[PDB]
Amino acid sequence: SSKAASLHWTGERVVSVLLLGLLPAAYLNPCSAMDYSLAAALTLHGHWGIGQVVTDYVRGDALQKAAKAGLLALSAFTFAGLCYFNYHDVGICKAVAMLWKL
Amino acid sequence: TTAKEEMERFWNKNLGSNRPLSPHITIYRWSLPMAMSICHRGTGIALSAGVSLFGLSALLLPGNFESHLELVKSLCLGPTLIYTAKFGIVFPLMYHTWNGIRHLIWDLGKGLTIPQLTQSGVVVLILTVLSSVGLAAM
Amino acid sequence: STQYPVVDHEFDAVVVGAGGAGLRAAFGLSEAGFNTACVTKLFPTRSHTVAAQGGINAALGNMEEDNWRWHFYDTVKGSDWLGDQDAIHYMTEQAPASVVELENYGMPFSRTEDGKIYQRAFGGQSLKFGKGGQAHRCCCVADRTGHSLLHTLYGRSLRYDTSYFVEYFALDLLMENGECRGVIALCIEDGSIHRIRARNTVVATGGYGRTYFSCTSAHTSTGDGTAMVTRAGLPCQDLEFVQFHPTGIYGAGCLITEGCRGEGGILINSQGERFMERYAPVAKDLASRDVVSRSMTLEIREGRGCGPEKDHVYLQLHHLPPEQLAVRLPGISETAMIFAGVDVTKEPIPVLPTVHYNMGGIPTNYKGQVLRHVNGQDQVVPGLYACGEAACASVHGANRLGANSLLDLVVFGRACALSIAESCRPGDKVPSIKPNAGEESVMNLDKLRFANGTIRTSELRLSMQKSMQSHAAVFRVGSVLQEGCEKILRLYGDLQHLKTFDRGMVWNTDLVETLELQNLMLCALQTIYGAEARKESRGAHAREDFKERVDEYDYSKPIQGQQKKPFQEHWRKHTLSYVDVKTGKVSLEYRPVIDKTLNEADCATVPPAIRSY
Amino acid sequence: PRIKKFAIYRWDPDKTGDKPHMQTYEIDLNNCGPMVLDALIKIKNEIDSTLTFRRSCREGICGSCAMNINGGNTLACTRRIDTNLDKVSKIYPLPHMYVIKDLVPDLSNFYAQYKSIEPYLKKKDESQEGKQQYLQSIEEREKLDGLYECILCACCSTSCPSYWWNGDKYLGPAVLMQAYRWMIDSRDDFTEERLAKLQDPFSLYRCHTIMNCTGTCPKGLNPGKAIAEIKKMMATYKE
Ligand SMILES: *Cc1cc2c(cc1C)nc1c(=O)[nH]c(=O)nc-1n2C[C@H](O)[C@H](O)[C@H](O)COP(=O)(O)OP(=O)(O)OC[C@H]1O[C@@H](n2cnc3c(N)ncnc32)[C@H](O)[C@@H]1O
Ligand code: HEM
Ligand SMILES: COC1=C(OC)C(=O)C(CC=C(C)C)=C(C)C1=O
Ligand code: SF4
Ligand code: F3S
Ligand code: FES
């Protein structure tokens, strides 16, 4: 049968190592590219993360279903908001930089 | 009777009864690992909240990032506060980062022994502090 | 009464006890297609067989060439000829198939380089009929064979439709006109009463070592099954032959497998002598349990103890490679440390002969059917079987050969299931039951439930244990024995002055431990009485008055010109005991031991010879 | 004279309106055994025989003792009492479980869970079973050491926060490790289907590698280390 649970588990580890290689990468080479992939991994990883906290603590078909739904929203508005920022603004990298020499 | 029917019987019997649940978190002995497990969540949660707040703010609030920064520069920013706030942000990120590396190593199936466990915990804790103070001055 | 509503269940067969024997009997009955119920007062896996460490005997021939017949010989001899040879034939011939069955079920046996079950040396087991040398047929799972045997059997049982009544206390057999109709039990969870009736009942309730003060057995070994048979007016056999195990920590009485000795370890007295070489040259440290302990127990008398009060001895393993004690005796290293605080790899363990196994129990057929004695003849009790330590098919006779009990468990557990499968069909008419069947049991329950007497259950039990410990130990004599009988019959009287405190319906361990006391008493009465009457020395039963092996003939010298003593003139016979539940009066009789095997051509009878290792 | 104080959880199902509470007992350690179970048995036989708890082997291999002693799940019969008369021992039932009475928990779900992984040997061809001993090199056999010694006491599972919150769908350490026991037995032929049974979000994946299970096993075993081995197998088996 399908190995959905197992694949999702691996998926998480993968973006976990990816988001691990990005932080350094983004320091050594700040650029618009980095700011996007950094937004992708940052939001995905976080989406799957809160996901686990939800399935863990929210008991009931009613609630979990909703919770998962509201989580997806927050994630969507989060990735979009970050991409907006990278487009119509400084970009997370330069924002961090700026924010630091302050 | 099957495994499933046995489970159904179990819940039907206990939920509908005056049987109390024995205490847990209130009595179980805290351990470094258990504590560091909690913090991983807490930080992951706090960290995600921050990132979301940065992205949503970028969509609803007016002005560019600079309008926001200059906005803070002219806020009497005390040096022994700009560093504090800068540390508070670096702390949970670093902790979660190092502990996360530890978590990954475990998935490879390494270091899963009580002895090895405490060592790595101490290490992860030390690296946290170092990289935090370190970054709060970069 | 009727304050306890009763629930009526109906099955094809019922098994009381989920130890090795019970478990094997239960799933074997289901595997055969019978709607089987299995009543146990403990979670199956908590059963005593889990504590078993040694191994299970079987002439598989993995270590060297072997012959189950040599296993047969060794066993009948080790019984001091009080063992029924037909049953011993059945057991040793079936052993190989029974052990391979366990391995095929998934038992994680320790392996050899050929990838076969690893077997090892053990107490008095030879080759070529006591001529070919030390044998190696003790199959084992490291040092936790019992634990693994019970778990794999339990696991295997999950595969079938057997209804397991967990944590249910069997009160009495449902008897009707000399025929068994099932059992009546107390559901410990809610205090309710259940009458599980069936066409066949199998009793595999274990032994009753707890009748004593110091024993290797669990707090749950209370002879509850023996007591039921006794309450039905049925006989119990050879209850006097109580096996004292050599190695038992001076402390709590916990056991250190005899496998230690078979693996290489030795026994040492205070002076440092390997006495088990003085009392028995050839077999030495690795001889019959009854002799080896009789030795040590003696050395303590001469004044050669190995600790403060010089009351015990010292088991050694030190000279064995630290790795070997890790691959062969890892289980004893743990408890040796935990209960003694020792590093076996560099120090000998403190052991002392303590009660261990019960050869006596419910009289059985080699097919597991319970026997009663009528006009000096055996008679099968319709719909009633027994197997395991609680049973006395008597394959152990006057003395159990080490590693033969786990075998017994599996073999006769299977035999019971097979005799039922071969004698009837699932769905057959399940016997009627009077609407008041079990009333006596419930009343006795209700009685102790609210007992407002003067003696505390624990107080009484303690009186019985220390009395047995002092009057019926490794050595005995009429004086010491008779004082014990009246001493124990006195305590039996006190069962009416007992005080209980807990009075709820849920988990009344107060009530059950008391019910268990009633059971332990019936067993002690039969043990001490049958012991006083047996004026001879055979196997574990050693009398100072009579250090003789009184047989039909004098098997030392020749036989032909000699005359055969009348049956009631010798002691080569099983003791049958009864007791008036109401007065505690012990009456006893005897029946012959079976000497013929199942087939002279395939396995010859072994005539009584002189006892020696 | 050496008096030791004992605070013990209590609750009578047959005492209308009773509510969980601690009852303290005192015991002269010179008139007692070295283990916690000895104390329990002692206050059971002399002070209050209404004190209920499971026990049997008092040797540490049956698993009947499982209970929380001073914040830790272990075996009362192996955990030696703290001779520090200044400290008062705290005995509670296994964590987050329905109490039937006093120190006695309902382990029905626990057992049921064990049954669901089919803890027995499964061959594709059972037509020849019972006639010959299956072969297994001592190498393949060593892989079971540390797995088969499980006593099923439930200390581990009952110490896992994930089992505390989702014990209904999360199998727990104890069961997971036995499933692993069967997964790596060279003689079993259903490895692939045993892993497939864990393809959902609860059975296995509620484990977040907290490690309390391993940190509390009375037998020094390592459930967590085994849960991780299953996880690796789960992400690399084919079909
Ligand atoms: C004590 C002991 C014995 C032992 C051993 C180690 C120890 C510490 N090591 C052995 C070894 O290495 N090799 C060997 O050949 N024998 C060894 N032994 C002796 C042997 O293990 C025992 O004789 C045997 O295990 C007894 O098995 P059996 O199946 O007959 O009995 P049990 O496991 O003790 O289980 C009793 C069952 O009956 C149920 N029960 C008891 N009373 C009731 C009541 N009243 N109502 C309902 N059920 C009841 C129990 O719950 C249990 O399931
Ligand atoms: C330095 C890079 C990072 C690494 C290596 C990393 C690694 C991990 C790992 C391995 C886990 C799984 C833990 C488990 O098994 O339960 C995890 C969980 C999580 N992470 Fe990260 N992470 C990183 C950065 C971040 C960031 C920046 C955020 C914030 C947006 C975040 C938020 C979370 C959350 C919310 C969880 C869920 C924890 C839970 O299951 O309760 N992580 N991370
Ligand atoms: C991350 O895993 C953990 C939890 O989630 C399952 C907890 O709730 C908790 C509990 C905290 C409060 C006291 C209920 C702990 C300690 C933990 O380690
Ligand atoms: S692993 Fe350890 S704690 Fe968990 S039941 Fe098996 S014995 Fe107990
Ligand atoms: S505590 Fe649990 S969460 Fe995993 S490691 Fe042990 S199963
Ligand atoms: S009673 Fe058996 S393990 Fe503690």
Residue C308, helix vs strand vs coil: coil
Cα–Cα–Cα angle for C441, C442, C446, nearest 5°? 120
> Residue C372's CB: how many other CB atoms inside 10 A?
18
Residue position matching structure tokens 């206390």: C169
Coil/strand/helix, residue C353: coil
By the 8 A CB rule, do C73 and C387 touch?
no
Residues β-bridged to residue C579: C586
Residue D73 near residue D66 (C-beta atoms within 8 A): yes
| Largest separation between any pair of C-alpha atoms in chain D | 68
Shared domain for D100 and D1, answered yes or no, is: yes
* D36, D11 contact by CB (below 8 A): no
Distance of CA C87 to the CA centre of its chain: 16
List the structure tokens of C571. Answer: 């002691």
Gyration radius (Cα) of chain D, Å: 21
**Out of D33, D104, D119, closest to residue C507 by CB:** D104
Owning domain of residue D41: 1-106
Task: Give the closest-approach CA distance of A77 to chain B in angstroms.
Answer: 6
Three-state DSSP state, C139: strand
Instruction: Indicate the DSSP class of residue C285.
Output: T
- Token pair recorded at residue C2: 């009727």
The CA distance from D67 to D75, in Å, is: 7
Instruction: Please choose, from the candidates D188, D182, D187, D198, the residue with its C-alpha nearest in 3D space to the C-alpha of residue D232.
Output: D198
- Name the residue among C279, C216, C277, C294 with its Cα closest to residue C48: C216
Half-sphere exposure of A31 (CA within 13 A, CB side): 4
Residue C381: DSSP 8-state = E
Instruction: End-to-end CA distance of chain D: give it in Å, rounded.
Output: 68
**Smallest CA–CA distance from A44 into chain B, residue:** B48
In terms of Cα–Cα distance, which of C210, C252, A27 is closest to D38?
A: C252
Label each residue of C529-568 as H, E or C.
HHHHHCCCCECCECECCCCCCCCCCCCCCCCCCCCCCCHH
Tell whether residue C71 is among the known ligand binding residues. Answer: no
**Which one-letter DSSP state was computed for residue D60?**
S
Paired tokens of C433: 């039951």
Residue C390, burial from CB neighbour count under 10 angstroms (0-12, 13-18, 19+):
buried
CA dihedral B103→B107→B111→B112, nearest 10 degrees, is: 100
Q: Is there an atom of ligand 3 within 6 Å of B97 CB?
A: no
Give the per-residue SS3 of C165-190: EECEEEEEEEEECCEEEEEEEEECCC
Q: How far is CA C225 from CA C13, C37, C196, C200, C220, in A?
A: 16, 16, 16, 15, 12
Tokens 């109906």, located at residue: C10
Q: Give D217→chain C minimum CA distance, Å.
A: 14
- Compute the distance from residue B117 Cα to the ligand 5 centre, in Å: 13
DSSP secondary structure string, C22-63? HHHHHHHHHHTT--EEEEESS-GGGSGGGG--S-EE----SS
Strand partners, C349: C315
Query: For A6, how many CA atoms within 13 A lie in the half-sphere containing its CB?
Result: 20
Q: In this structure, which topology does domain C1-248+353-431 adopt according to CATH?
A: FAD/NAD(P)-binding domain (3.50.50)
B-D Cβ pairs (cutoff 8 Å, strict)? 117
Inter-chain CB proximity D62 and C456 less than 8 Å: no
Query: Alpha helices, DSSP H only, in C281-424?
Result: 289-302, 324-327, 330-335, 405-423
Cross-strand pairs, C165:
C39
CATH number at residue D23: 3.10.20.30
Q: Do domains B1-30 and B31-138 have the same CATH topology?
A: no
Contact C155, D120 (CB under 8 A): yes
What letter represents residue C175's amino acid? Answer: M
Q: Are strands C168-176 and C179-187 parallel, antiparallel or unpaired?
A: antiparallel
Of A1, A52, A55, the CB nearest to D196: A1
Give the span between the Cα atoms of C511 and C188, in whole angstroms: 10
Q: How far apart are CA C183 and CA C38, in angstroms?
A: 11
Residues D232 and D116 in one domain: yes
Q: For the beta carbon of residue D132, count every other beta carbon within 10 angstroms.
A: 11
Residue D239 and residue D126 share a domain: yes
The secondary structure of A79-90 as a DSSP string is HHHHHHHHHSSS
d(CA C38, CA C165): 6
Cα-to-centroid distance, D227 and ligand 4 (Å): 13
Radius of gyration of chain C (CA): 23
Q: Which chain B residue shows the shortest CA-CA distance from A49?
A: B44
CB atoms closer than 10 angstroms to residue B74: 8
Q: Name residue C123's amino acid.
A: G
Residue D172 C-alpha, separation from nearest chain A C-alpha, in angstroms: 14
Q: Indicate the resolution in Å.
A: 2.4
The ligand minimizing its distance to the Cα of B101 is: 2
Q: Is C361 in the pocket of ligand 1 (CB under 6 A)?
A: no
User: What 3-state DSSP class applies to D125?
Assistant: coil
| Residue whose pair of structure tokens reads 């270590």 in the numeric block | C63
Residues D26, D48: Cα–Cα separation, whole Å = 11
* Fold of the domain spanning C432-548: Methane Monooxygenase Hydroxylase; Chain G, domain 1 (1.20.58)
What are the tokens at B72?
């803070």
Q: Specify whether D71 is located in the same domain as D145.
A: no
Q: How far apart are the C-alpha atoms of C22 and C19, rounded to whole Å?
A: 5
Residue C54 assigned ligand-binding role: yes
Q: Is B7 in the pocket of ligand 3 (CB under 6 A)?
A: no
- The H or E element containing residue D38 is helix D36-42
Residue C367 makes CB contacts below 8 A (sequence gap 6+) with C415, C416, C418, C419
How far, in Å, CA of C490 to CA of B27, rounded?
Answer: 48
Residues of A in contact with D198 (CB under 8 A): 5
Whole-angstrom Cα distance, residue A26 to residue A36? 11
Both tokens of B98, joined, read 């190092």
B54 touches chain A (CB under 8 A): yes
CA D146/CA B117 separation, integer angstroms: 19
Decide if A16 and B66 are in contact by the 8 Å CB cutoff: no
Q: Rounded CA gap, B93 and A42, in Å?
A: 12
C79, D89 Cβ separation under 8 angstroms: no
- Which CATH class, in words, describes the domain spanning B31-138? mainly alpha
Q: Is C588 within 8 Å of C577 (Cβ atoms)?
A: yes
Ligand 3 pocket, residue B41 CB under 6 Å: yes
Domain range annotation of chain B: 1-30, 31-138
Please identify which residue in the block is written with the tokens 């419930």. Answer: C442
Residue of B nearest to D234 (CA): B107
Q: Among residues C138, C124, C133, which one has the least CA distance to residue C63?
A: C138
Whether the Cβ atoms of residue C216 and residue C245 lie closer than 8 Å to each other? yes
Rounded to whole angstroms, how far apart are CA atoms C130 and C287? 12
Q: Is the CB of B46 under 6 A from ligand 2?
A: no
Report yes or no: B62 and B71 within 8 Å, Cβ to Cβ.
no
C461 catalytic per annotation: no
CA C458 to the chain's CA centroid = 24
For residue A57, the chain D residue with the least C-alpha distance is: D165
Beta-carbon contacts of residue D59 (< 8 Å; ≥ 6 apart): C51, C218, C252, C254, C255, C335, C339, D77
Residue to mutate, D57, D73, D150, ligand 6, most ligand atoms under 8 Å from C-beta: D57
D194 and D239 part of one domain = yes
Q: What residues form DSSP beta bridges with C38?
A: C15, C164
Give every CB contact of residue D185 below 8 A, 6+ residues apart in sequence: C106, C108, D121, D143, D144
Q: By the CB < 8 Å criterion, does D164 face chain A? A: no
Q: What distance in Å separates the CA atoms of residue A82 and residue A87, rounded to the nearest whole number? A: 9
**Of residues C289, C328, C372, C414, which has the active-site annotation?**
C289
At the top level of CATH, which class does the domain A1-102 belong to?
Answer: mainly alpha
C-alpha distance from residue C124 to each of C117, C251, C285, D215 (Å): 21, 28, 10, 43
CATH topology of domain C249-352: Flavocytochrome C3; Chain A, domain 1 (3.90.700)
Q: Are C43 and D53 a contacting pair at CB < 8 A? A: no
Q: What is the DSSP string of D136-194?
A: --HHHHHTTTTTTT-----TTGGG-HHHHHHTTT--HHHHHHHHHHHHT-TT-S-HHHH
In sequence order, the 6+-apart residues with CB closer than 8 A to the CB of C108 are C141, C148, C152, D141, D144, D148, D185
- Of C490, C464, C487, C540, nearest to C240 (Cα)? C540
DSSP state of C400: P
Cα(D226)–Cα(C113) distance, rounded to whole angstroms?
Answer: 27
Tell the CATH topology of B1-30: 1.20.5
Say which CATH topology domain C549-613 has. Rhinovirus 14, subunit 4 (4.10.80)
Q: Phi/psi at B87 (nearest 5 deg)?
A: -75, -50
Q: Select from D78, D106, D134 the last residue of a domain.
A: D106
Asked if C327 and C205 count as a contact pair (C-beta separation under 8 A), the reply is: no
- Number of domains within chain D: 2
- Choosing from D38, D58, D80, D91 the residue with most ligand 6 atoms within 8 A of its CB, the one to mutate for a pocket test is D58
**Host H or E run for residue C231:** helix C224-231
Which whole-number Å values give the CA distances from C131 to A16, C127, C543, in the listed order? 70, 6, 30
D116 and D162: one domain?
Answer: yes
Q: Lay out the sheet containing C36-40: strands in order across.
A: C163-166, C36-40, C13-16, C200-203, C377-386, C369-374
Provide φ and ψ at C69, rounded to 5°.
-70, -30
Identify the CA nearest to C186 among candidates C7, C362, C433: C7
> How far is Cα C263 from Cα C268, in angstroms, rounded to an integer?
16
Same domain (yes/no): D68, D169: no
Token pair recorded at residue D133: 């001993």
Domain extent listing, chain A: 1-102
Domain boundaries, chain C: 1-248+353-431, 249-352, 432-548, 549-613
All residues at 6 or more sequence positions from D128 whose CB lies less than 8 Å from its CB, including other chains: none
**What backbone phi and psi angles, to 5 degrees, belong to C312?**
-125, -165
User: Residue C455: beta bridge partners?
Assistant: C498
CA–CA dist B32, B59 (Å, integer): 40
Task: Give the CA angle between residues C87, C89, C91 to the nearest 5°.
Answer: 70
Q: What is the 3-state secondary structure (H, E, C) of chain B?
A: CCHHHHHHHHHHHHHCCCCCECCCCCCCCCCHHHHHHHHHHHHHHHHHHHHHHHHHHHHHCCCCHHHHHHHHHCCCCCHHHHHHHHHHHHHHHHHHHHHHHHHHHHHCCCCCCHHHHHHHHHHHHHHHHHHHHHHCCC
